[PDB]
Design a protein around this nucleic acid. Sequence first.
RNA 1: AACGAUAAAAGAAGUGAGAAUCUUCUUCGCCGUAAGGACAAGGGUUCCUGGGGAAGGGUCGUCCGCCCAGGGAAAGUCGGGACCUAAGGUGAGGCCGAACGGCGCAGCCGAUGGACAGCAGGUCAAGAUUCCUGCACCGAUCAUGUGGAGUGAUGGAGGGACGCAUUACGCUAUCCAAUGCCAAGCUAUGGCUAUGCUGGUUGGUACGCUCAAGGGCGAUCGGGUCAGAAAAUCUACCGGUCUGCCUCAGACGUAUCGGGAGCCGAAGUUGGAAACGCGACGGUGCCAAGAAAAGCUUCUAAACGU
RNA 2: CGAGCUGGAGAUACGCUUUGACUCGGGGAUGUCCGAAUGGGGAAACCCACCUCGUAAGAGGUAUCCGCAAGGAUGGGAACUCAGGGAACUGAAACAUCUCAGUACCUGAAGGAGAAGAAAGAGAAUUCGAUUCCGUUAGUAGCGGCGAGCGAACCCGGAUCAGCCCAAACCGAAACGCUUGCGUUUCGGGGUUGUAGGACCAUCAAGCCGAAGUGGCUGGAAAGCUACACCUCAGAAGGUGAGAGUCCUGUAGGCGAACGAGCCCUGAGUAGGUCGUUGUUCGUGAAACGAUGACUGAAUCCGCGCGGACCACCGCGCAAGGCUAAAUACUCCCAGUGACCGAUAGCGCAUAGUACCGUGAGGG
Lengths: 54, 92
Amino acid sequence: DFAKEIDARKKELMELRFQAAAGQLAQPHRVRQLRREVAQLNTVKAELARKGEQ
Amino acid sequence: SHYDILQAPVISEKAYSAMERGVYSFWVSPKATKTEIKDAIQQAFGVRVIGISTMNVPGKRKRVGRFIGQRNDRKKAIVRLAEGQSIEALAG
RNA sequence: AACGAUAAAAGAAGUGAGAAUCUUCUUCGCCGUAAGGACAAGGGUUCCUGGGGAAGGGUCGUCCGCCCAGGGAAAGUCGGGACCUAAGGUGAGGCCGAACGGCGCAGCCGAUGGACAGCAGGUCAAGAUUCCUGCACCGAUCAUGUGGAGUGAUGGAGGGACGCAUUACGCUAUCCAAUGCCAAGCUAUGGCUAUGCUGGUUGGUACGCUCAAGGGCGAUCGGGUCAGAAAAUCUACCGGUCUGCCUCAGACGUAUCGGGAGCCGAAGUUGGAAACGCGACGGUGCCAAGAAAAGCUUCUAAACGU
RNA sequence: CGAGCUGGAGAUACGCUUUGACUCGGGGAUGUCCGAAUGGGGAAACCCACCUCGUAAGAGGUAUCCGCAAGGAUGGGAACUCAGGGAACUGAAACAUCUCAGUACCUGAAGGAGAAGAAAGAGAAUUCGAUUCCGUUAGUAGCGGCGAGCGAACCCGGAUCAGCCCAAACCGAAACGCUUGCGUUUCGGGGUUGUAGGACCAUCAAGCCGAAGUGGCUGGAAAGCUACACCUCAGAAGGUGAGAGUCCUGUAGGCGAACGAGCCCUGAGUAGGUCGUUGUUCGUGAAACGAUGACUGAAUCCGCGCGGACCACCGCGCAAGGCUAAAUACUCCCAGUGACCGAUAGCGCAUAGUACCGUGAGGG
Ligand SMILES: [Mg+2]
Ligand SMILES: [Mg+2]
Ligand SMILES: [Mg+2]
Ligand SMILES: [Mg+2]
Ligand SMILES: [Mg+2]
Ligand SMILES: [Mg+2]
Ligand SMILES: [Mg+2]
Ligand SMILES: [Mg+2]
Ligand SMILES: [Mg+2]
Ligand SMILES: [Mg+2]
Ligand SMILES: [Mg+2]
Ligand SMILES: [Mg+2]
Ligand SMILES: [Mg+2]
Ligand SMILES: [Mg+2]
Ligand SMILES: [Mg+2]
Ligand SMILES: [Mg+2]
Ligand SMILES: [Mg+2]
Ligand SMILES: [Mg+2]
Ligand SMILES: [Mg+2]
Ligand SMILES: [Mg+2]
Ligand SMILES: [Mg+2]
Ligand SMILES: [Mg+2]
Ligand SMILES: [Mg+2]
Ligand SMILES: [Mg+2]
Ligand SMILES: [Mg+2]
Ligand SMILES: [Mg+2]
Ligand SMILES: [Mg+2]
Ligand SMILES: [Mg+2]
Ligand SMILES: [Mg+2]
Ligand SMILES: [Mg+2]
Ligand SMILES: [Mg+2]
Ligand SMILES: [Mg+2]
Ligand SMILES: [Mg+2]
Ligand SMILES: [Mg+2]
Ligand SMILES: [Mg+2]
Ligand SMILES: [Mg+2]
Ligand SMILES: [Mg+2]
Ligand SMILES: [Mg+2]
Ligand SMILES: [Mg+2]
Ligand SMILES: [Mg+2]
Ligand SMILES: [Mg+2]
Ligand SMILES: [Mg+2]
Ligand SMILES: [Mg+2]
Ligand SMILES: [Mg+2]
Ligand SMILES: [Mg+2]
Ligand SMILES: [Mg+2]
Ligand SMILES: [Mg+2]
Ligand SMILES: [Mg+2]
Ligand SMILES: [Mg+2]
Ligand SMILES: [Mg+2]
Ligand SMILES: [Mg+2]
Ligand SMILES: [Mg+2]
Ligand SMILES: [Mg+2]
Ligand SMILES: [Mg+2]
Ligand SMILES: [Mg+2]
Ligand SMILES: [Mg+2]
Ligand SMILES: [Mg+2]
Ligand SMILES: [Mg+2]
Ligand SMILES: [Mg+2]
Ligand SMILES: [Mg+2]
Ligand SMILES: [Mg+2]
Ligand code: NA
């Protein structure tokens, strides 16, 4: 399911990128926030790798 | 995956007249190929692709501040769909 | 001093603060196997659009290959790679050497060569065998059907596979003439009233009991082990065995998709010329004796089935 | 740590932050492509694959040499160390020996150092006691076309000092080797030398806490002038509108974290020799000794090597097996300091290996 959680931020980042290429990018911060949420969402995966499996 | 292969739509008076033909034009990450670029377009927008063409494009060599500049480097791809010619309608 | 070839330039009109130099019009002179056009190397946005005017431009500059910004670059079929080999470069093993290193079989890399499927048009300001329209071709996977069985290799054979000069026949590109056709209008200067003048006068594809130079080819049954590693129903050797088949270059007709001077679309004739291109790997002569590999065609080995 | 932050960046929009941001100290996790590059190819950063994961998207592997295997190596370093190679200008007022110099350079190996190191030594006292470094000996002894010139060591004074284990004589094997309780190499015990021994037999970190001044005057502005004070384990320094002990940062001093770094034997193709050579002061000299390139080739403790041809005596030492910290060198990097520079100086650069030049190496 974590891939499902990731690609939603991906698609919003894509359509938001399109909007930036056009005439409307009124909240630039929503960009890097979404990128944050991807990094976090992957970093958490790393913590379930070594945990449990040892 | 597919979302971040697509770069940003071309905004060109030529590209927008092609918008009226069912033709769609947008930049992509240059190291991608046609096969994956097509399944990306059609995973994303839900539409059959019947025609792809692609072209590497050098970055223009602009100069700011009297420090000589560099290139930028892109790969515009043009695509023709089936008769189901919709995208998001977001054309203008 | 020079302002980079002695191929001249003139007028009108425009834009602008500003003009011998920028734009337009009408003339003039210069190249025309070029000083026109299409590519390869190489250059790297110089391309198109809109702006600018410091510096760059041998003067000027409203302009520029200069500066700023935005666009433009599309391929199953073109060129290269996912195919092949040449010189050369590499090169496990191997041969050498105070060290670093030097040679080197197979193999590998390496196009300047081999192999390989598309042609006609339209057209952005800026791309075209790439996009679009018309109509093809090539490989691969699958499905339906005919077929209802043999496929047939990192190995064998054929073949690809090649010189120079000269030259017979036929043809197209392409070029010329005309009282052929088609289109448009006019004419004065002294004349012509059109038999004058000007211009255009076919590309691709599909189908022909159509005309057609030229060009390619012998063909099986069997013997031998000692030949191609063995195999072999394929090759090579040897012995028996009887003009004709194929191919269309190109032309012609019919149809169709285009293009076509021009004010949407006319005509598409007869006569002549003619390639180094095509038919083709033709013919003849000559000595200095004119790559290799894959693709391609043919055979079994193994295996898989029947 | 306790209010800011959103790199230089100086330009706005957008936000983030007292449930602690930003910044600092310390760990993790991501880590495209090239590059020893290592799946195969290659004109670096691009082309082309295969195998298991297999739902895909994505992940993991696929070089060679060492080794059963773990596990190791390949490449990169300013200078410093050791080694294999090894110049020439030059001086000799010419030039051969000689010097320059085992200097430069090339190559190999390694580390924070390295090399060397535990006496078959030095040496002349029957002294000494591993190696390295410094002082001195001493430019003495010597070497030398006895020319130019080159040039030790011992004693003594310092820096630091540590000594250690294997081979083998004999036990016990096991495996293999043959006419019958033996001898080729492994594994344990044992055993390691010259006054001969041994066997067998009796604190630094990120940081936190930190004393003491006010009025008038000149002036654009106080830190200067002035007048009265105050701290001082703190008058080092920098900032602040001009010169500040008492305005700020600090200073003396004090504290200071989860994870954080840091001391019968005793070695043989040898010792020794002849031929070529060479190293130390050693240039064939009366030329010992070590060193190998070629050919030969011993002895055991009443034995072996040396003491500068050689002999006797008298002395010193046990070769042919290994390891070994520290005193030494250097400066890419960091800190402090300076009778060092301060914009033609100082590094080439107040930053740039840039612009620019070159096909390049390279210069700049
Ligand atoms: Mg296409
Ligand atoms: Mg001149
Ligand atoms: Mg004019
Ligand atoms: Mg005017
Ligand atoms: Mg002016
Ligand atoms: Mg002129
Ligand atoms: Mg002009
Ligand atoms: Mg006009
Ligand atoms: Mg031309
Ligand atoms: Mg080019
Ligand atoms: Mg180009
Ligand atoms: Mg132009
Ligand atoms: Mg223009
Ligand atoms: Mg322009
Ligand atoms: Mg100007
Ligand atoms: Mg300017
Ligand atoms: Mg000018
Ligand atoms: Mg392409
Ligand atoms: Mg096509
Ligand atoms: Mg090709
Ligand atoms: Mg090849
Ligand atoms: Mg070769
Ligand atoms: Mg070689
Ligand atoms: Mg070629
Ligand atoms: Mg072809
Ligand atoms: Mg046009
Ligand atoms: Mg053009
Ligand atoms: Mg065309
Ligand atoms: Mg002819
Ligand atoms: Mg006539
Ligand atoms: Mg005519
Ligand atoms: Mg057959
Ligand atoms: Mg006709
Ligand atoms: Mg081959
Ligand atoms: Mg802070
Ligand atoms: Mg700032
Ligand atoms: Mg590689
Ligand atoms: Mg590699
Ligand atoms: Mg690997
Ligand atoms: Mg000389
Ligand atoms: Mg001299
Ligand atoms: Mg000499
Ligand atoms: Mg040196
Ligand atoms: Mg070196
Ligand atoms: Mg090294
Ligand atoms: Mg001493
Ligand atoms: Mg001060
Ligand atoms: Mg005071
Ligand atoms: Mg011994
Ligand atoms: Mg000897
Ligand atoms: Mg000798
Ligand atoms: Mg002499
Ligand atoms: Mg002697
Ligand atoms: Mg000796
Ligand atoms: Mg003596
Ligand atoms: Mg000074
Ligand atoms: Mg300077
Ligand atoms: Mg100056
Ligand atoms: Mg320099
Ligand atoms: Mg250059
Ligand atoms: Mg250059
Ligand atoms: Na007339």
